[PDB]
Structure 1
């Protein structure tokens, strides 16, 4: 078996290898990359997502989210308070302010220490989940707005034709902005490109060990666990690397820099934080190997996780028994 310790793998495709997205994903899996839950892909040196970022300040963040924490430094939840709209130029100036900017630090490890020590004491503002793309339409390779759709993958593998669409989302981050522990909707893949700015640190649990993270989460967030059988779908819980190590949970970490892709694999739990002002683009995707994970994915029926139009069809086709109760949660 390839990559039996489930290490995060880093790939350096040539421009020739960068032509066929599906083929490259299947290659990475042939090398065991999925066992980690996360891989890094460094694009060929000749490739570019777009010519410049010089004109992005006019994008609107309609609903910036203030991420307010509760708990202790290593075990906390976050709630998202909605704020007034602001442009990306306004948000960048806020991120660079004395109140919100990245502190002085020695290197990524010192910064990671400072994040886990101090995150809970601040409420950074995250411009998350903004439909749109920053890839130039002329970028033909690994353009996250031109990928084959999940509905077309389900049709090709299973014959069934369903409604729904599959589009990217932009994320504008600042120091301490945080993504809670989660897998993707319907345990899909994700791909994330860091267009610009400061890094993003990721933590990941191997898919084969995801249930160990779930059992710890039930112990650490026991009222949330009684409220919902899949409360990590709410995307609010944080657990630090120190706490994961104290509880024997297998995990890995890696820092993504501007210009780099990350792929998350089906049922790869991940969490992380931004080092400073940045912009990422991400989208979900499927391969044939996902189908079985989609059939088995947990679902939030408490009603909190409240997810897309397109996920309806996935549930209806892959999980017809759940259909009914999951749509009672979503209506």
Structure 2
């Protein structure tokens, strides 16, 4: 994939069953070079009978997103509100003061997003522990994907919420997620159970460093106070600003019933079009490991997702364990190489 563009995939039912092999397949197709890929499951597939039980479900920690800034550069502050249900949230989301506006093309909605970002602060029901998969769904079950990230709980019992456990995200119009790569520069998977679309922007892993250089110029106090201030997931940067400073990016809209897959060191951001609900978790492959080892983490606060790479290096790269543990493994990552599990392809 020489243009590092966002690809879309339509696996048949036979290809869909083994998750790790399909991930490996799309990397042999170079999907990973965009940092983001969309996957459309066969029409024969569905993760849950109906979404009707849900109105009684609780959102423990609703977050009100207040946004300050101007001229393409914004900082998002997350004011926590008090708990509420899906029935309550849908009421406020479809309300006349928070609902989606009418529009022609997508480009129109996008303009309205970047123009009104900082007015009428919406509520985002984020980080809600839980799944909406029925127990019998055994293909692409975000709850139990069986990838090597499962080695983290198997050898230490540590469950990191949202990372090796699923998260549910209830959004309304204009709720967004700031520019970030995943914790420990992992993969993520995101399924949009129902409702209005979710739009995404993405920067190819091979240019992520350019985005960081730009971000440290725009936010010098923040750069100075943390080795990786973007992991705070508070920074929004408009596509025009990226364009103006010559950072390659791509955009995609995810509609209900479709998957997004993000790749290691793939910076991404986006917003919800209206009331919807999405499930998300991280995962890993053998290719992730070197990213794992070199990832720069937040340096200024505690309770930051940090994962011990020792177990991974001992098991999958034993020849370099001693060099690494002694700090002499000066390996250099090539963002275009696909994961070794694609030797089948």
TM-score between both structures, scaled by the size of structure 2? 0.87
- 1:307 corresponds in structure 2 to 304
- 2:142 corresponds in structure 1 to 144
**C-alpha distance in 2, partners of 1:224/1:150?**
34
Query: Residue 267 of structure 1: CA displacement?
Result: 0.3
Deviates more, 1:313-322 or 1:243-252: 313-322
Residues 225-240 of structure 1: matches in 2 within 5 Å? 225-240=223-238
**C-alpha distance in 1, partners of 2:55/2:105?**
29
**C-alpha distance in 2, partners of 1:294/1:36?**
19
Is the counterpart of residue 162 in structure 1 residue 156 in structure 2? yes
Q: 2:34 aligns with which of 29, 33, 36?
A: 36
- 1:207 corresponds in structure 2 to 205
**C-alpha distance in 2, partners of 1:32/1:107?**
30
Displaced runs of 4+ in structure 1, greater than 6 A?
A: 315-322
Residues 78-227 of structure 1: matches in 2 within 5 Å? 78-153=76-151, 161-165=155-159, 166-227=164-225
Q: Tell me if the contact between 2:203 and 2:267 (Cα under 8 Å) persists in the aligned partners.
A: yes
Query: Residue 312 of structure 1: CA displacement?
Result: 4.0
Structure 2 residue matching 1:57: 3-state secondary structure: helix
**C-alpha distance in 2, partners of 1:65/1:220?**
26
Question: Where does structure 1 lack aligned partners over 5 or more consecutive residues?
Answer: 323-331
- 1:23 corresponds in structure 2 to 21
**C-alpha distance in 2, partners of 1:146/1:161?**
17
Q: Tell me if the contact between 2:20 and 2:147 (Cα under 8 Å) persists in the aligned partners.
A: no
Q: Tell me if the contact between 1:153 and 1:287 (Cα under 8 Å) persists in the aligned partners.
A: no
Structure 1 residues 48 and 302, CA gap change in structure 2 (3 angstroms): same
Query: Residue 321 of structure 1: CA displacement?
Result: 8.8
For residues 252-279 of structure 1, what are the alpha-carbon distances to aligned partners after superposition, in whole Å with 9 as ceiling and x for unaligned?
Answer: 0000000000000000000000000000
Q: 1:57 aligns with which of 55, 58, 61?
A: 55
Structure 1 residues 321 and 101, CA gap change in structure 2 (3 angstroms): farther
Structure 1 residues 62 and 217, CA gap change in structure 2 (3 angstroms): same
**C-alpha distance in 1, partners of 2:310/2:276?**
34
- 2:341 corresponds in structure 1 to none
**C-alpha distance in 1, partners of 2:257/2:310?**
34
Query: Residue 107 of structure 1: CA displacement?
Result: 2.6
The root-mean-square deviation of aligned C-alpha atoms, in Å, is 1.9
Q: Tell me if the contact between 1:73 and 1:118 (Cα under 8 Å) persists in the aligned partners.
A: no
Q: Tell me if the contact between 1:73 and 1:119 (Cα under 8 Å) persists in the aligned partners.
A: no
Deviates more, 1:276-285 or 1:106-115: 106-115
Question: Where does structure 2 lack aligned partners over 5 or more consecutive residues?
Answer: 314-323, 328-345
For residues 69-105 of structure 1, what are the alpha-carbon distances to aligned partners after superposition, in whole Å with 9 as ceiling and x for unaligned?
Answer: 1111511000100101100110011001111101111
TM-score between both structures, scaled by the size of structure 1? 0.90
Residues 242-257 of structure 1: matches in 2 within 5 Å? 242-257=240-255
- 1:290 corresponds in structure 2 to 288
**C-alpha distance in 1, partners of 2:121/2:95?**
14
Structure 1 residues 229 and 18, CA gap change in structure 2 (3 angstroms): same
Deviates more, 1:246-255 or 1:99-108: 99-108
**C-alpha distance in 2, partners of 1:10/1:314?**
32
**C-alpha distance in 2, partners of 1:154/1:138?**
24
Structure 2 residue matching 1:16: 3-state secondary structure: helix
